[PDB]
Design an enzyme around this catalytic site. Sequence first.
Site, PDB file in Angstrom:
ATOM      1  N   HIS A 108      -9.303  -4.270  -9.146  1.00  0.00           N
ATOM      2  CA  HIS A 108     -10.578  -3.735 -10.006  1.00  0.00           C
ATOM      3  C   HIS A 108     -10.843  -2.463  -9.717  1.00  0.00           C
ATOM      4  O   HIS A 108     -11.161  -1.670 -10.498  1.00  0.00           O
ATOM      5  CB  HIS A 108     -11.716  -4.707  -9.256  1.00  0.00           C
ATOM      6  CG  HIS A 108     -11.954  -6.010  -9.448  1.00  0.00           C
ATOM      7  ND1 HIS A 108     -10.960  -6.896  -8.751  1.00  0.00           N
ATOM      8  CD2 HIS A 108     -12.600  -6.818 -10.076  1.00  0.00           C
ATOM      9  CE1 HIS A 108     -10.949  -8.122  -9.052  1.00  0.00           C
ATOM     10  NE2 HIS A 108     -12.159  -7.961  -9.809  1.00  0.00           N
ATOM     11  N   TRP A 139     -12.318   5.570   4.287  1.00  0.00           N
ATOM     12  CA  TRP A 139     -12.194   4.210   3.681  1.00  0.00           C
ATOM     13  C   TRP A 139     -12.018   3.273   5.061  1.00  0.00           C
ATOM     14  O   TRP A 139     -12.548   2.219   5.178  1.00  0.00           O
ATOM     15  CB  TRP A 139     -10.897   3.958   2.806  1.00  0.00           C
ATOM     16  CG  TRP A 139     -10.662   2.600   2.468  1.00  0.00           C
ATOM     17  CD1 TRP A 139      -9.670   1.770   3.180  1.00  0.00           C
ATOM     18  CD2 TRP A 139     -11.099   1.795   1.467  1.00  0.00           C
ATOM     19  NE1 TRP A 139      -9.521   0.495   2.378  1.00  0.00           N
ATOM     20  CE2 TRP A 139     -10.464   0.515   1.496  1.00  0.00           C
ATOM     21  CE3 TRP A 139     -12.150   1.817   0.646  1.00  0.00           C
ATOM     22  CZ2 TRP A 139     -10.748  -0.411   0.691  1.00  0.00           C
ATOM     23  CZ3 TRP A 139     -12.466   1.181  -0.343  1.00  0.00           C
ATOM     24  CH2 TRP A 139     -11.853  -0.275  -0.369  1.00  0.00           C
ATOM     25  N   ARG A 168       0.967  -1.181  -0.137  1.00  0.00           N
ATOM     26  CA  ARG A 168      -0.022   0.052   0.043  1.00  0.00           C
ATOM     27  C   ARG A 168       0.977   1.275   0.096  1.00  0.00           C
ATOM     28  O   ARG A 168       0.498   2.154  -0.597  1.00  0.00           O
ATOM     29  CB  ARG A 168      -1.050  -0.107   1.323  1.00  0.00           C
ATOM     30  CG  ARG A 168      -2.212  -0.997   0.933  1.00  0.00           C
ATOM     31  CD  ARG A 168      -2.840  -1.559   2.000  1.00  0.00           C
ATOM     32  NE  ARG A 168      -3.880  -2.304   1.628  1.00  0.00           N
ATOM     33  CZ  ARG A 168      -3.802  -3.600   1.412  1.00  0.00           C
ATOM     34  NH1 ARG A 168      -2.627  -4.282   1.350  1.00  0.00           N
ATOM     35  NH2 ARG A 168      -5.086  -4.383   0.942  1.00  0.00           N
ATOM     36  N   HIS A 220     -20.308 -21.468 -18.749  1.00  0.00           N
ATOM     37  CA  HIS A 220     -20.473 -20.495 -19.671  1.00  0.00           C
ATOM     38  C   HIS A 220     -20.724 -20.542 -20.998  1.00  0.00           C
ATOM     39  O   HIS A 220     -21.383 -20.121 -21.707  1.00  0.00           O
ATOM     40  CB  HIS A 220     -19.035 -19.855 -19.477  1.00  0.00           C
ATOM     41  CG  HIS A 220     -18.653 -19.151 -18.203  1.00  0.00           C
ATOM     42  ND1 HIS A 220     -19.670 -18.155 -17.816  1.00  0.00           N
ATOM     43  CD2 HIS A 220     -17.634 -18.946 -17.410  1.00  0.00           C
ATOM     44  CE1 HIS A 220     -19.231 -17.677 -16.581  1.00  0.00           C
ATOM     45  NE2 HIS A 220     -17.977 -18.183 -16.550  1.00  0.00           N
ATOM     46  N   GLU A 267     -21.717 -15.478 -14.445  1.00  0.00           N
ATOM     47  CA  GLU A 267     -20.870 -16.147 -13.428  1.00  0.00           C
ATOM     48  C   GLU A 267     -21.780 -16.799 -12.333  1.00  0.00           C
ATOM     49  O   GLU A 267     -21.595 -17.936 -11.822  1.00  0.00           O
ATOM     50  CB  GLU A 267     -19.980 -15.013 -12.472  1.00  0.00           C
ATOM     51  CG  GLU A 267     -18.864 -14.552 -13.109  1.00  0.00           C
ATOM     52  CD  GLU A 267     -17.932 -16.050 -13.159  1.00  0.00           C
ATOM     53  OE1 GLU A 267     -17.387 -15.939 -14.403  1.00  0.00           O
ATOM     54  OE2 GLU A 267     -17.480 -16.316 -12.230  1.00  0.00           O
ATOM     55  N   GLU A 287     -16.591 -23.499 -16.233  1.00  0.00           N
ATOM     56  CA  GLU A 287     -16.337 -22.953 -17.657  1.00  0.00           C
ATOM     57  C   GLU A 287     -17.191 -23.464 -18.686  1.00  0.00           C
ATOM     58  O   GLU A 287     -17.926 -22.683 -19.723  1.00  0.00           O
ATOM     59  CB  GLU A 287     -14.891 -23.209 -17.924  1.00  0.00           C
ATOM     60  CG  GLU A 287     -13.758 -22.603 -17.164  1.00  0.00           C
ATOM     61  CD  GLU A 287     -14.331 -20.995 -17.101  1.00  0.00           C
ATOM     62  OE1 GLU A 287     -14.446 -20.341 -18.007  1.00  0.00           O
ATOM     63  OE2 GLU A 287     -14.017 -20.470 -16.016  1.00  0.00           O
ATOM     64  N   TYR A 332     -20.077  -8.912  -8.224  1.00  0.00           N
ATOM     65  CA  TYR A 332     -19.955  -9.838  -7.333  1.00  0.00           C
ATOM     66  C   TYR A 332     -20.762 -10.347  -6.111  1.00  0.00           C
ATOM     67  O   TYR A 332     -20.996 -11.363  -5.636  1.00  0.00           O
ATOM     68  CB  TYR A 332     -18.428  -9.851  -6.820  1.00  0.00           C
ATOM     69  CG  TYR A 332     -17.496  -9.872  -7.853  1.00  0.00           C
ATOM     70  CD1 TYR A 332     -17.043 -10.896  -8.541  1.00  0.00           C
ATOM     71  CD2 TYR A 332     -16.629  -8.628  -8.011  1.00  0.00           C
ATOM     72  CE1 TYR A 332     -16.297 -10.731  -9.784  1.00  0.00           C
ATOM     73  CE2 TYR A 332     -15.689  -8.562  -9.033  1.00  0.00           C
ATOM     74  CZ  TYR A 332     -15.444  -9.412  -9.808  1.00  0.00           C
ATOM     75  OH  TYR A 332     -14.776  -9.444 -10.854  1.00  0.00           O
TER      76      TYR A 332
HETATM   77 CL   LIG Z   1      -7.090  -2.115   2.068  1.00  0.00          CL
HETATM   78 ZN   LIG Z   2     -16.466 -17.969 -14.573  1.00  0.00          ZN
END
Ligand SMILES: [Cl-]
Ligand SMILES: [Zn+2]
Lengths: 194, 597
Positions: free
Chosen positions: B487, B459, B151, B360, B384, B357, B497
């Site tokens: 991400h 945060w 970090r 998919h 997913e 997979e 997600y």
């Molecule tokens: Cl963090």
């Molecule tokens: Zn997948």
Amino acid sequence: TNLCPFGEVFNATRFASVYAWNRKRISNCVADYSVLYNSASFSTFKCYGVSPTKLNDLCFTNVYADSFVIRGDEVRQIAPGQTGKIADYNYKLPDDFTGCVIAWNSNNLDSKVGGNYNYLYRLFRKSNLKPFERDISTEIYQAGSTPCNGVEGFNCYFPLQSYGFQPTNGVGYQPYRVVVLSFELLHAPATVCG
Amino acid sequence: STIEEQAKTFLDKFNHEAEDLFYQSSLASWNYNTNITEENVQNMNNAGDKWSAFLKEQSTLAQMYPLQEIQNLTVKLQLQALQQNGSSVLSEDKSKRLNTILNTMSTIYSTGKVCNPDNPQECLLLEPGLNEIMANSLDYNERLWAWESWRSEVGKQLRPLYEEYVVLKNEMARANHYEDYGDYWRGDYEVNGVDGYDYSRGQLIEDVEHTFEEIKPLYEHLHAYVRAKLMNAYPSYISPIGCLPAHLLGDMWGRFWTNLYSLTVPFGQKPNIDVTDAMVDQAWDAQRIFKEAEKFFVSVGLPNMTQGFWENSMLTDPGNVQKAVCHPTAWDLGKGDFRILMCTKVTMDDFLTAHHEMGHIQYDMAYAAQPFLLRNGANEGFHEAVGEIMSLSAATPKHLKSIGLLSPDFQEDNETEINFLLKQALTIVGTLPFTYMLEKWRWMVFKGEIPKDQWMKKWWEMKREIVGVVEPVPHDETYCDPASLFHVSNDYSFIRYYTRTLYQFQFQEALCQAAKHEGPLHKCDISNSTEAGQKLFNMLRLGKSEPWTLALENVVGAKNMNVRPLLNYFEPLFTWLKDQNKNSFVGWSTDWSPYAD
Ligand SMILES: [Cl-]
Ligand SMILES: [Zn+2]
Ligand SMILES: *[C@@H]1O[C@H](CO)[C@@H](O)[C@H](O)[C@H]1NC(C)=O
Ligand SMILES: *[C@@H]1O[C@H](CO)[C@@H](O)[C@H](O)[C@H]1NC(C)=O
Ligand SMILES: *[C@@H]1O[C@H](CO)[C@@H](O)[C@H](O)[C@H]1NC(C)=O
Ligand SMILES: *[C@@H]1O[C@H](CO)[C@@H](O)[C@H](O)[C@H]1NC(C)=O
Ligand SMILES: *[C@@H]1O[C@H](CO)[C@@H](O)[C@H](O)[C@H]1NC(C)=O
């Protein structure tokens, strides 16, 4: 008593694009329609009107053999009373059709890596084809109101698109060679028998 | 004549051009990814450039037909997808600045390195070096060094870039008439003009928050159990009432708690199911693995793989001469060409991944008849979710016995199921507060609710409050700890997600009902149930031609995200956790920290 030149229609090195479908007139010869059926090398052999086994016992004045290449998924449009891009804009069978439709997979000849773009089909047309009509024009299709002046632009598309046949396509996208046999009866003597 | 009829003709032309241009790109991308060469990077870049150029040109062209004058909704859906100009609503200078910022943050993340404070020439990258520490080390100080120096070395670099990224993305989003970039992201869930199926962008905020409230008691109890287990192992580092130190969570962020399993396993002498030896005993290979997964999908009424799949996929590591990108991926190239790329090993993990997979692929095959632009999951969470439920069924003892990899003399009992559910919960439930909290912080940054000079302060307050995790070292506003996760620094939305996790248990619950499964939901195997396969297939073939609310309802009879199946799945663990925690404090105070003494 000569043999009808079917080998040169079925075994041609290169087939026509479906929008410019090829026609061969068959005349004054003897045709063994049960060697064609009993080849066991065709994925489609559906006659409309009389059985092959039975039409080998027949005579007609003229036989026509139209041939072209299309996608696997499109062979079903080569039949009476179908719609779609092929049936509407490229090759149209009449309702009272009495011949045969033959097809087989030609992925081994008509596709190649990077793409075979040799074969085209008509994507747009101001109206649908009459049966056994052929349109080979290359006029820009005017989809809007502004004229095209012979070039592509907004609402102005070249009316023929290319298939892109790669050997790795799925079967629905692979190229299929198609032969259509039309049988006609008239007042003149029947020059095609078996 | 009309505007709609011209749009139809425009899309008719786009579809045919796009299919071939997308196909060349996918093909060039495939040859690079199975054969890493400099020549192949080149072909891949050129064919992708042609495809990118085709789309920008077609996007401009599509914007000349106003949706305001289109009534046919699937025409409207396609035109709208093509019209989203995105970055090209910014000035060229701002776009180039943004793409430069995006590029720099990406290479900072992928090339960032820390060197140990003793040897300035011996360094570690995130992958494999720091990840191996954060997943495997039990040493408190090694883990702390990896966490902190990631970090401070790479996160600090990302801070100024991230500030300018937010400004430009917000300009981009407002110019496209969103209220900010987070609202832009929430656009994935929007549905308009379908009575009884609409869904607003703000509605997603409320449903994530409402479903999350119902998740908190499971999570508090999981957290309290895990804290007690870790306290036994680190008695001088963990308070019985405090948050968990962020560097003790099993990966670089605590994204998943998977790697806490060895220290938290309930019944530590019960055998774990691993059919790997049995696969090697029976001389399975990659081919057999994928033949088994194919058999799985055929058993519920779904097509086998195409011949091209078997001919063109790459299912084993291609030897050592050619190098390949071995991350498992399902490829939909177009034109009926479907492929899996996977360096398959003879293990249970890769056996489950292959079912994932191939799910998919099964989704891809089912919507292949949709027009080009509607060939996708109903929203970002669907693909997913569909993949995950296939590994659920394939891993159960019932299924492993059925295919001869697990002895019939295997004894399932109370304890081995609690073990399994806890391992499941560490991964699945553990990531839900992490995922919600991270996206909430971004949504508030994009909305302007968090001043720049409180970015890190907010945060870490939200980590302590929502997630029960506390930073082991104080971080001022020179840090950018959000961006130290892929991400964030690579500009991907994260709520997918969360939504995916709820969807998958909704699907699995519905499909297991249609399969007439008796017993706790986590034991279900949908194998041999054509009623389950049909119900799934009814949603799969939709692609994104219908609202996702309707697509969901096709499978599960409801129109919205629902937590009840997730809780239903975890209920046996919930009651066990609650009992375990009777002698523990449940919950966390947020003022304790590792550095405050
Ligand atoms: Cl963090
Ligand atoms: Zn997948
Ligand atoms: C086409 O060539 C094959 C191979 O020689 C042959 O067997 C077949 O009879 C030919 N077709 C016709 C119609 O003669
Ligand atoms: C890998 O790529 C090179 C050039 O990029 C090519 O010549 C070679 O044939 C490829 N290998 C295989 C196994 O296809
Ligand atoms: C929308 O358009 C497609 C093709 O233009 C057509 O098949 C479909 O029936 C239309 N649906 C509505 C509701 O207009
Ligand atoms: C897939 O299943 C169908 C149905 O029996 C069968 O005809 C086809 O040959 C199968 N495909 C393969 C590659 O085995
Ligand atoms: C599915 O059915 C076949 C045939 O009865 C059987 O061999 C197989 O074990 C079944 N699988 C399950 C999970 O019941």
